[PDB]
Amino acid sequence: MQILLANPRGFCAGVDRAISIVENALAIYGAPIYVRHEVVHNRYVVDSLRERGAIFIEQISEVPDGAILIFSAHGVSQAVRNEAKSRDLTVFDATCPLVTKVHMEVARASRRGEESILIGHAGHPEVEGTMGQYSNPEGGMYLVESPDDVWKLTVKNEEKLSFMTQTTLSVDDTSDVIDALRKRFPKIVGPRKDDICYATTNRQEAVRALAEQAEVVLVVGSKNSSNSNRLAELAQRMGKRAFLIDDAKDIQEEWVKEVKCVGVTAGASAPDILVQNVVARLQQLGGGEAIPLEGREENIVFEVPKELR
Ligand SMILES: O=P(O)(O)OP(=O)(O)OCCCCO
Numbered sequence: 001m002q003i004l005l006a007n008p009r010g011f012c013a014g015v016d017r018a019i020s021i022v023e024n025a026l027a028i029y030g031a032p033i034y035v036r037h038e039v040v041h042n043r044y045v046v047d048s049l050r051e052r053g054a055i056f057i058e059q060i061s062e063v064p065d066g067a068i069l070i071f072s073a074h075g076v077s078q079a080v081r082n083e084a085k086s087r088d089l090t091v092f093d094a095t096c097p098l099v100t101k102v103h104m105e106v107a108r109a110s111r112r113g114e115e116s117i118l119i120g121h122a123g124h125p126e127v128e129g130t131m132g133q134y135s136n137p138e139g140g141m142y143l144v145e146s147p148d149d150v151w152k153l154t155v156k157n158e159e160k161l162s163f164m165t166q167t168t169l170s171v172d173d174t175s176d177v178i179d180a181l182r183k184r185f186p187k188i189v190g191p192r193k194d195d196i197c198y199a200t201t202n203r204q205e206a207v208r209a210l211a212e213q214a215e216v217v218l219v220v221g222s223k224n225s226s227n228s229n230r231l232a233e234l235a236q237r238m239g240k241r242a243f244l245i246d247d248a249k250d251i252q253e254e255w256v257k258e259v260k261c262v263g264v265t266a267g268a269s270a271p272d273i274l275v276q277n278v279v280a281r282l283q284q285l286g287g288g289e290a291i292p293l294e295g296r297e298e299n300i301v302f303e304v305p306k307e308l309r
């Protein structure tokens, strides 16, 4: 059985920065360091950090006075930030710079009192954080997930309307929502294409090329990671069996029995050691040396804030 590796795969620049922010906090200040939400949606990364004394909470009212609190890479609402700010807390912000870029647009729309539409998945923490930058009651901030949602949306002034997206969506599905938004609201203003980040776009392009070659695709990533689920979905829609797995223990022998080519990729929140262990297990199940595919080069790094070097 041949094993192909997608390229690019695995950690993006925002995830590497956010993990480094927690580790450095722990190294500088000691345990405990509190973190609002899983710093990234990866069970291994979060368990790792938990065993080293990070405490992950959902709500700020779970954090003691005077503690150190880190916001996860997904970002947080103005309300969360004020709730932390007017509290005793030392805060470091691990929000990815590419999520903050979208927040700055929503904030500008809010100040002008002009309506904004976010394309994103209800309940996702990045969506809560981004919707949560809009506060002007004179305007409005609306979430849409699909063309159907666009077809039922009514707004107050469609002459003054902008859109923004979550960064970890399907490029193809988002394109269909934006096509609907432009047809419904011909004056709507937005980015050229979407706010989908380089890392999401690049891993979906890489998984398309992988699925073209492989009969079965394993995507290393946790169930609550949006971008990881989009990679699995993409391979499934190309007609390949695709599984989202946390680690090598999850591989069921039936999935690769009689399979001549298996592909492996990893979401932006999944560490390389997990892919290494998945490859070692596929080798036990008859796979040969892992062959990395040729891929688009990634060169972006985001540094930790100087306070945490
Ligand atoms: O893919 P999602 O947005 O669920 O988040 P993740 O933690 O799995 O991957 C890194 C994204 C962090 C902010 O975009």
Ligand code: SF4
Pocket: 012, 013, 014, 015, 073, 096, 097, 098, 099, 167, 168, 197, 198, 199, 200, 227, 268
């Ligand atoms: S997936 Fe994209 S937006 Fe999210 S942390 Fe990575 S680079 Fe940033």
